[PDB]
From a paper:
[name] from Trichoderma viride is synthesized as a precursor (prLysOX) and the N-terminal 77 residues are cleaved to produce the mature protein composed of 540 amino acid residues. The active site is present at the bottom of the funnel formed between the substrate-binding domain and the helical domain.
A single prLysOX molecule is in an asymmetric unit and forms a dimer with the neighboring molecule related by crystallographic two-fold symmetry. prLysOX consists of 617 amino acid residues, and the final model contains N3–R44, G51–A70, and E79–K611. The propeptide region consists of an 8-turn amphiphilic α-helix (F6–L34, αN), a proline/glycine-rich region that forms a repeat of turn structures (G35–P62), and a loop with a short helical segment (L63–R72). Unlike the precursor of PAO, the propeptide is far from the entrance of the funnel leading to the active site. The propeptide induces a structural change in the helical domain, but no significant change is found in the other two domains. αN is inserted between the helical domain and the FAD-binding domain. D289 and F293 in α9 move away from the active site.
Author numbering:
A (entry chain A), B (entry chain A): 3 to 44, 51 to 70, 79 to 611
Amino acid sequence: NVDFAESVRTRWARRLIREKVAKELNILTERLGEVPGIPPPRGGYSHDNLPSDPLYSSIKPAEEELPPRKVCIVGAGVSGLYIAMILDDLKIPNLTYDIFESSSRTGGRLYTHHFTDAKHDYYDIGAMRYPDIPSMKRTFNLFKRTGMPLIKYYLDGENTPQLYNNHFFAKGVVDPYMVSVANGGTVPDDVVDSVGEKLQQAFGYYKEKLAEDFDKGFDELMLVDDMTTREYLKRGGPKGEAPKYDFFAIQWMETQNTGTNLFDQAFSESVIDSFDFDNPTKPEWYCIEGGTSLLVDAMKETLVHKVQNNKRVEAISIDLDAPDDGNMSVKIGGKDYSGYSTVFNTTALGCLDRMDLRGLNLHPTQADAIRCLHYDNSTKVALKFSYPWWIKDCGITCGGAASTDLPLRTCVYPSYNLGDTGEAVLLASYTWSQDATRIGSLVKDAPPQPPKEDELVELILQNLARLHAEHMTYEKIKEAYTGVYHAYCWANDPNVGGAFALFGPGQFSNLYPYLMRPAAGGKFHIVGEASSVHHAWIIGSLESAYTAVYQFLYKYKMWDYLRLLLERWQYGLQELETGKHGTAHLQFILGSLPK
Amino acid sequence: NVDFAESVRTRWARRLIREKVAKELNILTERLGEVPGIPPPRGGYSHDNLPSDPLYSSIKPAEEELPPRKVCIVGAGVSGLYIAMILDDLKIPNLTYDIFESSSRTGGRLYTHHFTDAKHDYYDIGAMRYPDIPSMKRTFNLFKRTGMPLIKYYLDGENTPQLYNNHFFAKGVVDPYMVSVANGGTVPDDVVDSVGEKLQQAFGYYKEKLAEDFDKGFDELMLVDDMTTREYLKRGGPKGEAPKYDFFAIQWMETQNTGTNLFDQAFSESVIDSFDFDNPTKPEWYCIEGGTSLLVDAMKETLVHKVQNNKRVEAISIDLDAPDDGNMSVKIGGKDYSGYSTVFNTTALGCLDRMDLRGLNLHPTQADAIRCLHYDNSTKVALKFSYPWWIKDCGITCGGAASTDLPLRTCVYPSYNLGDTGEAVLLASYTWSQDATRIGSLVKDAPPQPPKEDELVELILQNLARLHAEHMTYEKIKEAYTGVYHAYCWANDPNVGGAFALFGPGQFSNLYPYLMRPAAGGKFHIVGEASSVHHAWIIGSLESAYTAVYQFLYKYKMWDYLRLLLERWQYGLQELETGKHGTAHLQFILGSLPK
Ligand SMILES: Cc1cc2nc3c(=O)[nH]c(=O)nc-3n(C[C@H](O)[C@H](O)[C@H](O)COP(=O)(O)OP(=O)(O)OC[C@H]3O[C@@H](n4cnc5c(N)ncnc54)[C@H](O)[C@@H]3O)c2cc1C
Ligand SMILES: Cc1cc2nc3c(=O)[nH]c(=O)nc-3n(C[C@H](O)[C@H](O)[C@H](O)COP(=O)(O)OP(=O)(O)OC[C@H]3O[C@@H](n4cnc5c(N)ncnc54)[C@H](O)[C@@H]3O)c2cc1C
């Protein structure tokens, strides 16, 4: 048995599915009376009373029979590659696939940039760090399968500076930044040095409720599911007997919040997220020695069918006049590619919304889920210096990250070059949201002609000097700078359009059931991190792929290989609720309805 | 006398100033007891009881005496040019100025792109339309002063298509898009065809309160000042006895909302905004024949001192060790420019936050106001066709704008080429927020090499065909396309960083008093649309400039030219509350405090 803290996210997700399916089943039994796949008897359905799987008798463990089939994988990020890897391992007779990549590059949001092919001469533009928590079992299994060299990622370093209001942070000092009301600021005195615990308090109130009675706690959490984290703090709602915080208190919390947007996401999932690290929040973090793109390389090279880059799918369709399995097609550069029995789309939702999907006959609400989700921006700037001055001169010897209200916002000291004494890469700027958009405005796809330094480099070098002024001069940093740098803004990437999906108030609880269920007669799948309760991480991408493969096997009643899937590829807690009294078959049925 | 509807925005803004000043005065009288500029007597101060202007006896109407002074204007957008125009007209003896422009282009968010120098061969990337409402008096005066050729802007056209859920809009049809619950959708049946009135209802409830008792209404509006428009609709708060709307209802409202973001701004200013057009909302709209940049041209050419382009200010400072007037300086490309008695900064706040402002010794809360405000993204795509097929084939003969859930979102039919039969420009895509970021990801600063068509053009042409499918084929539009197009995304512009400031919940009421008040001993001014209650429009930019010039004249006690300013340059309702019992002098004093 897994303890409560590690089980709540999955229980939460599964309950959300049941809530939606029950309403849609009631509605359809009140819109058609009969539902294809069920035997309706006589509002009726509810979240803890849904029909059993009528096909379960075939799923109990207890050559060329399978007709030749071909599936299409849209996207060669980690989700698409994982689908292909699973399919390869299952070795389904006469089953083949095409995997199309829009970019010339494979990997998607797994993206290491190499300045040279020198050992440590890189930086990760996408995913870079991985926590050893139980929800990440599937991820670390993939690392094992592909033989990834894992090293320690230092989240908290030594002597990393913090700079706000042009004051450096100092331990055991009341309001070191001098921004509190007592020192002529507007930040409330009870908040300025206690941001972390006020937040933990707000979440802890609902974590405590869920702990002793989940359903009761779930019902209470639903009352704040329709509000942002900022809103909850600005109301203490919904009643609200919870502690209030004025405008400047919350603004200071947001200021101190570097990293992805939290205050504009649903408070309910902010609460769920605080369970993620309650084994507790001192697990070990890991990164891949040589860059995350080593995973991409290992995965794409073991594929039975090679990734086709520079193939941008612009339309997806199904021919319902044709009774055969392979009646689906995609359009690439004006050319039709047909004969597919299933299409897995693994792109970011913005990319999918850009396609012509009329041929799929998607229901408007599912089309909404694809269109309406926002993506959080992220930008990275990396600079090469002739020596690691932060290690040697500043005493920053074990990674970590600096924080400031300066434009660069965060400076990340690499965990993979701690012993180097020569040329060294620094992740000088790591930003999110509006900060990332601002730095991104300075990042141009066509770099300046050597050796001219543009506004971005000049801004970063100046910010770095002020941030490390306790040990470094601006002159010294400029001299140490080799003239080599690279930068990347994800919202400017047409193939992705942001770091990862942001779920606003009510968006996950209402749209996640739609993103997870099949379409086009159970032949179309929306795959990717955003389609999973484990979103914004690799695990979400990997779990979504596993889920979609399940529903694909279920669609064509390949019970032998469905069982094989459950034996070989089930890691951690399974997101999809399968079994006789599960909901996977109901999502399948709702996603396979005729027209 | 002006009627209530046209006075509420100014009364609202002036009251917000009084609320903040009263708190800061009480605080400072509880932090220092004495305040430089006042004679404190003995919590005490309140919004309707603030000290009179001790210098008013000099301001009542009732050669070279003025020492030589020089001021710096940062930014050659419409705000900076307007400052220069006012200064020129006042002809203050021995007063000169430098105006520095970061871009090679003058005009900022006034930006017409000319494909050729042909008569109608352009499109406006920034501001383009201007409503004849009383708040716009200052704007139309500027148009008159510069001799702008005004023509009719058609907001609502004829036969403009609307496309949602792949259904075209049709009058007198219940749920034409088929997205309501009754037709298997999730949009509530009472909302789907009545979005406009449900919104008007929500605002009308508070507009009604303000109408009969402003202060009482103001106090009630403050209770919803800390919530978004979406939040208010999702709560009916704050009590809340107001009508509720579920997730899909509000999502449909947002979907139908093309144009700038509204649902994430404060509900309080959403209410105030609904007064903007209550003379009512059928005023005439105007645009400038030949493009908005004609205004920029007229303004910059009449300037006594020519705009210096390619001059990016990277730092602003004041020398408090020096008792002389001109003790301020700016840094441009590593070079110091000194001798300034006042600096007017007119840049977008993101640009100002990018500067080194340590030499100004800004108070942390004012620095917050500069840093924390978000900007709404906007993107435009314009295409040239060999003939105006929308006029000739589609019957769209009087401008207007199409609306769709397709990627291009809105298609604007130009009001300045209605009679043309040959080559014609179409504003094929006009987007905001996340939509603008997505289209913007396809807009690259280095265009494709002729005559290759990139993903953006292909996407737009396909969307245009579906949008105008009632009269046009995709083939026909492709043939009509000349191969010439241009696109621009404002969040990608490092000199601006977005369309205009977005004021989230609580942000205007709390930060506007800081953005409006001087700094650095009353010698530094934050100027621009975001510094005004009339923000996101040209009037806000123009009113901010006028306000800053007032405080500049007041700082150096130039009463002769201060009076001249009030006689010649006072248009519409004055935002800044001046007079004996005003608050301008208190903002000045709070903004001139020593260190
Ligand atoms: C900056 C950043 C930091 C992160 N940090 C971490 C971290 O520390 N740890 C962690 O576990 N996760 C992290 N994440 C998230 C993680 O990287 C993602 O969840 C995951 O990589 C996404 O995988 P995916 O295959 O679902 O989507 P993607 O990687 O986006 O794959 C989609 C692919 O489809 C392609 N595509 C798009 N449009 C089309 C089209 N029309 N036709 C064909 N192909 C198309 C794209 O090019 C892309 O390659 C981070 C992400 C980012 C951006
Ligand atoms: C797409 C769009 C549509 C709009 N629609 C309308 C409309 O229909 N009607 C309407 O009235 N208004 C509209 N607005 C708003 C209006 O255009 C603006 O309010 C106004 O033009 C902004 O003027 P400004 O001088 O305050 O700022 P800006 O125009 O931004 O001027 C600031 C200047 O400072 C410069 N600068 C930046 N950084 C530096 C630096 N470090 N050193 C020196 N200079 C620097 C910039 O290049 C810029 O030129 C629209 C705006 C946009 C973007």
